Write a protein that binds this ligand. Structure first.
Ligand SMILES: Nc1ncnc2c1ncn2[C@@H]1O[C@H](COP(=O)(O)OP(=O)(O)OP(=O)(O)O)[C@@H](O)[C@H]1O
Ligand SMILES: Nc1ncnc2c1ncn2[C@@H]1O[C@H](COP(=O)(O)OP(=O)(O)OP(=O)(O)O)[C@@H](O)[C@H]1O
Ligand SMILES: Nc1ncnc2c1ncn2[C@@H]1O[C@H](COP(=O)(O)OP(=O)(O)OP(=O)(O)O)[C@@H](O)[C@H]1O
Ligand SMILES: Nc1ncnc2c1ncn2[C@@H]1O[C@H](COP(=O)(O)OP(=O)(O)OP(=O)(O)O)[C@@H](O)[C@H]1O
Ligand SMILES: Nc1ncnc2c1ncn2[C@@H]1O[C@H](COP(=O)(O)OP(=O)(O)OP(=O)(O)O)[C@@H](O)[C@H]1O
Ligand SMILES: Nc1ncnc2c1ncn2[C@@H]1O[C@H](COP(=O)(O)OP(=O)(O)OP(=O)(O)O)[C@@H](O)[C@H]1O
Lengths: 300, 300, 300, 300, 300, 300
């Protein structure tokens, strides 16, 4: 019996070995990415029973994705390689921090996801259902799917977890607010970053009042992150580390909190766990390569 | 005063360090490809005054392409980085030789090429105009452009050189025949491989009769290649070498022939030069990394 | 419902990037090996329902093995990480071909295998049971297990497949003959190489007469391999390829044969399939990295 | 005439290129390790005349060890490749610091060392004899050897230097105390870490009183280290550096102090030198790759 | 119309992948260096129209240099591969910071530069002419050239920019002062480091009074750098970064200031820009690999 | 008691990882070369007591050379690091086989060698003295030294072994003939390749008549090599292998012959041994990395 179920579009990340403009690189590292994918693996590595819903192309990259998910022990009952191609993107980290990403995923097999992409009875007995704001922003079908998904979850007593994850590349602030404004009602746990709230509601303050969900978690980068549960405002501090490749850390952060929730842990321990995973991934290259295993926590 | 002018869509090649299925690779080599791009560089390296017409995206890969073309001394008077993205592809070489290519170029800035993409007075005094069958196969605009291009060349007394380079991925044998049957009249030099003729005209025989251009060159892989000039059938033998990454060899072959023609060399020396370039690139990784320089010929 | 079930000791292979004495290497490639492990994966890749029986240590290498087997879709119902360590070895390929292997497996968790290591009802409805002569050579428990295993298979109507795979390191020619002379009766399909037969029965002739099993397959290296079925002697030719890392090729060969048998294919096609897998793995580094997938055969 | 003589079991270290669980690595760095080996080379690099006593297997790894020791200018008068194998181990550094090591050395040629392993007249005129608590913990023979070694040294007026180096993997705290309690009398210089004293005598305090040797040096990690000589308690501060691969730093620390002693340097300069070497090795990968040369000190 | 013109000897830098004595490295990174070369590329990357005057050998390294300069968009109107060889050097970074460089450039094609090495009309309309104290120190011809160069610049209303860049390897402090004492009159902008002034004029104070040029810039390492313009003493602070490979940072620093000057920017913004480029190159390996592009500033 | 003594200039070889023009490489492999250095190591590896006479610079590369020679067990009684620099060179292997070497050795510490560079009583009881035609070609001092060296050997009853090893880069065919015509009298064993004899005496025939030494060995590349001893003409065949990096093979060949001679082996076995070493080094990268050890012969 699964505890958590996530869904979205898997992606392959192409990253240079060191900082510097892409144009000057001659070799690239291949990684398996995708917001929800990162969360899926992070959870699995911690022993949480998780399944991943999505599609990939019938190509080598799609296969690559499938192996990783399978190798990591993720439930792929409703995951499969379908006609089409698997999306990819190229990251670029500059000497002084400023990065830039180039996508090649439009019209991918994974961006198809529409209402009914999987059997609802899958969400039976499931603790949480996790989705990212990236999914609905991909297409009209994806947006519909997302809404549909969290509706069948609520109907089955499945808490809905959402990570805003606003992408300026996918949709405009209004389109994003338009969605949130519509989806918010079915959300139980909301993950939001400072910049996002700022970029969508002017200031972190308003955002919190507008997006008032049962449990909101405001990621403050290294400044830790706040947990707004029962009117209470718990604070959590990030782990002092040297940010290597900050990509995928927010997803890892989410996974740490969910695991904590799944295990019915105090808000203090849920935040602690979340910041731990976010730091590990942040201090490692790849999309989710730094994600720790249960055995690591046990030892720490 | 340019001698040769080529045009088409530039591409970035992602190739693994060694043979094996893509899905198992963790690092990939970045190369600048594109049929006519390979030809452009190969000719420049030999000291031939050549210009390249085309567009790339306003991204890092498009920039990368720009530098290589500029570094190699290709005239980019009508080349530029325009809005959009630069197409790329992923090659895969299997243990026993069978390869497989994955494209990510649909809707790229380079696939735009339409009639008038450049100033015709550019072709003034130019010896040859080189185009590949890949260009017209990309889009209705590109096909129109190609036709337009060789029309403005002919009217400027510029010989038209064409390398069939049939791609099953771009169009069907009939669509290809349909094009050739239409373009053939304006072609002065035609490059064709044995498989292509067989895949489009049943047998190498018919193809040669149907596609009877002033000068046809049939590439026979390692079996050399035949030159059909003045009813005469000159034969040329390939250089004994160990095929490393056969990609881009045909383009390199064409470039060697053209240089020979540009230099008014006998058919014997044109074929010799062509097979030399084809062998060099074949015996090296990347799309055109093996192309030799003038100084190499001088010494050899 | 499984079709094939194999068992033995999994191993991790440490191989240098290129030829040369080990003592001069500064970096080594990590691979998951083990005769029956190679066979298991090769079959899974071809779509054959296969399960793997064995143990590994509760360490990181044992975990690594577990993921690969799981990622590849092998049934690990009776496979698990138990106390102890996972065995490993170091290969060394010299400039002129002569290699040398260094083991670090004595007393490993995988060398434990004894009678009853798994539930016999696992072999219910299974087509074949595959074992290598390496297993019984490890310890008195392993030898007993092997005998026990093929006994429970025969009583379940499960054909027994064996690959002599004689290791001078594990036991003497007499000890090996002693085993075969004892096990032979329960064997249905026997895999044997020319050197082995010669090293154990003087000449390939005698060996074939002494080891007369229902179906014997004599691997002749590149000289193909002969299939002795119904008194008939079918011949098969190997695929012309450049041997990169010949390790694991024999295991891959067996897997190709079994798949052919499982699919009820003519001896012609069984040998064809077997030589195909052997060539692929031979032409690639690692213990079973070159094994092809079903989709590759379909296309070829 | 040698100044310092050390002895023990040499080891080969297999380390990943970056942090992360071993199970996910595909390439490993090969290094020559072994506590006493690290000290031997560190000393040699500083111009100190040092000899190394020990055995390795008659394999490629044993050979590798021999080259390094020879290349580094260590006296191998009583070092040799003997029948058997050379031990090795695999390190693993996790994203957030927690590491884990896996050994493959039980029954190695190096763990044989017993009383009389070398000619005592070797220690004639020698300044110090260095041994680690790892040696005696290997086997009953090794423990006997160790005791025997420091006895023949004392008899020849050779100061005995000992680095507790307690390994929970080799023996229990009591077995360790049992040894120390017996060996202590012949020790002249004792190296001990905070954790060790804590793990063996409850608190750093007791340990110091129980293990009261002429000169004790308490390594405090980055907190420097204290030198307890003539009732005096000199303090030394560590060099601000980014710990890369902390392995082998304690050995390097010891070597720096010994060199200082060998050169009859003030306790302030002995500590300074020791912390210097510990920092260098700490800030570099491998077991002793960071060890500085005399020319480096000269310049600093 | 060019804005800035620099000249000197190009060099190829051979650097190890990590810290440690050269003697122990088995692989080296190849980079294109040369003070003035670093400045040339840095400027070009920022969109400044710059030309480079110099020679390289008719070898592969000389060719390598030419490609980079061309690829980077530097004007090579008076740059060319001439008979002779291209100089190179080998860097070595030690664990605790202390480095050491080994040169192989004496008698190189680039060290030839003498009066009239290029057409003076080249400096027509040019904003600045940049030279390093390395050039004149190479040979009597180079020293003469340098003096000659800044004379034809002044005559054409071209401001002279000079980076002391004192090399103890090339000439003695007196020879250096002898030059400065003679060249100073024609200098408009002077770049000087703290150590240099100290090593040549006793204390930073004297140096500033002796070398009183219209605009002097004192590089203080990480302590930023001071700008002495109109009697005014503007201060600038360096960007907090982890010095990777500090080589080429001073050149990058100069380039940032020049660009700022070329763009007629306030002294505050000229210093800001300079410290920015110095930090980027400092935080990256190679001679000028970290140099940012205009697009980076635009974004920051 | 040494058996063989060789002398010359040591060199460091910089080689790319794969074929291709140098200008396109970003990483290079570092190797220790030098004709007589290759011979010295090859012999030491075979257990032959050999000493090496020469000098290197007081730099890191000179140190590197020193370690290898010491690590390999070569007697360096008359070898040392002296003021100056250690020479190096850059190799380049093209796709189709044609290579090209770039030197950086002129005026090196090793090119100093003059008469009396070492104590003649060193050659006491020594079997052979080996020198290459590269040594005398370096400078007038080196040529004098070489003559001097073989003179002191002859007077000590030490057979003189010489490998023409003609370098077009060092001196002209006449200068080489001039030397040989002068040195020949003191030569006992002469190593010569087909191209060399042809390039110096028109045809292999004349050369053999003119250079008639007690024992001449003509290397025929892969066509084996002929041994002209007692008027007898023994023939030897090369080992079928895939030439990787043919550099240093001739030196390795000489070493195999010498060892055979030193061991008083028949001409049949001397040639067999020689071709074996030549093949091994040919089939491996570096200057002498492929040289086998005694233990390899024993086993083979
Ligand atoms: N250096 C760091 N040290 C500790 N935790 C960090 C660090 N960097 C990021 N994190 C963790 O990651 C979470 C922040 O992630 P962030 O706000 O950057 O979203 P994101 O990572 O950019 O989203 P994505 O992963 O999709 O790119 C924080 O709340 C924090 O717990
Ligand atoms: N091993 C080889 N030795 C010598 N020449 C070769 C070799 N392989 C290819 N060539 C040269 O390349 C030309 C053949 O190229 P080919 O027929 O394979 O088209 P292609 O290379 O596949 O087209 P593309 O370069 O776009 O992939 C031949 O006519 C020949 O001159
Ligand atoms: N170069 C090759 N080309 C084609 N097939 C090959 C090649 N090398 C090996 N094989 C295949 O592998 C089988 C031979 O394997 P082999 O006799 O060498 O046992 P093995 O591979 O050494 O056993 P193991 O895999 O455990 O090391 C052959 O029968 C053949 O089909
Ligand atoms: N970051 C650091 N900076 C400076 N010195 C350090 C650093 N890390 C370790 N050291 C030096 O190493 C010595 C500490 O070593 P430590 O206590 O960690 O034993 P150890 O290194 O773990 O033993 P081993 O080398 O066998 O693993 C200290 O006393 C200190 O001088
Ligand atoms: N860690 C750093 N952070 C920020 N800026 C730095 C850093 N290191 C160097 N710089 C910049 O580089 C300039 C200093 O360079 P520096 O004084 O070291 O000359 P240099 O770099 O050694 O000369 P060269 O580049 O030829 O080796 C400073 O003024 C500063 O702006
Ligand atoms: N492929 C090969 N197979 C077997 N032996 C070879 C091979 N290549 C070279 N050799 C051996 O090397 C000797 C030939 O060396 P060669 O004539 O090429 O001089 P060289 O190697 O070029 O000199 P140097 O080593 O200084 O470059 C031959 O006589 C032969 O024994």
């Amino acid at each position: 019996m699964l505890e958590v179920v996530t869904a979205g579009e898997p992606l392959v990340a192409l990253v240079p070995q060191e900082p510097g403009h892409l144009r000057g690189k001659r070799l690239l590292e291949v990684y398996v990415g995708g917001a929800e994918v990162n969360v899926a693996v992070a959870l699995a590595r911690l022993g949480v029973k998780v399944g991943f819903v999505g599609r990939v192309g019938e190509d080598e990259l799609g296969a690559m994705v499938e192996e990783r998910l399978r190798a990591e022990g993720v439930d792929l009952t409703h995951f499969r390689r379908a006609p089409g191609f698997t999306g990819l993107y190229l990251r670029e980290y500059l000497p002084l921090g400023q990065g830039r990403v180039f996508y090649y995923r439009k019209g991918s097999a994974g961006s198809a996801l529409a209402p009914g992409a999987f059997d609802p009875d899958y969400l039976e007995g499931v603790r949480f259902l996790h989705l990212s704001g990236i999914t609905p922003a991909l297409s009209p079908e994806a947006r519909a799917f997302s809404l549909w998904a969290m509706e069948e979850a609520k109907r089955r007593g499945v808490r809905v977890s959402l990570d805003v994850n606003y992408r300026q590349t996918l949709w405009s602030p209004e389109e994003a607010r338009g969605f949130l404004e519509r989806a918010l009602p079915g959300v139980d746990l909301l993950f939001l970053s400072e910049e996002e709230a700022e970029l969508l509601f002017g200031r972190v303050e308003e955002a919190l009042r507008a997006l008032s969900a049962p449990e909101v978690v405001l990621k403050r980068g290294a400044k830790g992150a706040w947990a707004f549960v029962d009117g209470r405002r718990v604070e959590g501090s990030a782990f002092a580390v040297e940010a290597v490749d900050p990509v995928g850390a927010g997803d890892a952060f989410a996974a740490g909190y969910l695991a904590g929730a799944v295990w019915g842990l105090p808000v203090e321990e849920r935040l602690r766990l979340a910041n731990l995973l976010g730091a590990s991934v942040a201090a490692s290259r790849g999309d989710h390569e730094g994600a720790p295993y249960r055995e690591d926590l046990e030892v720490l």
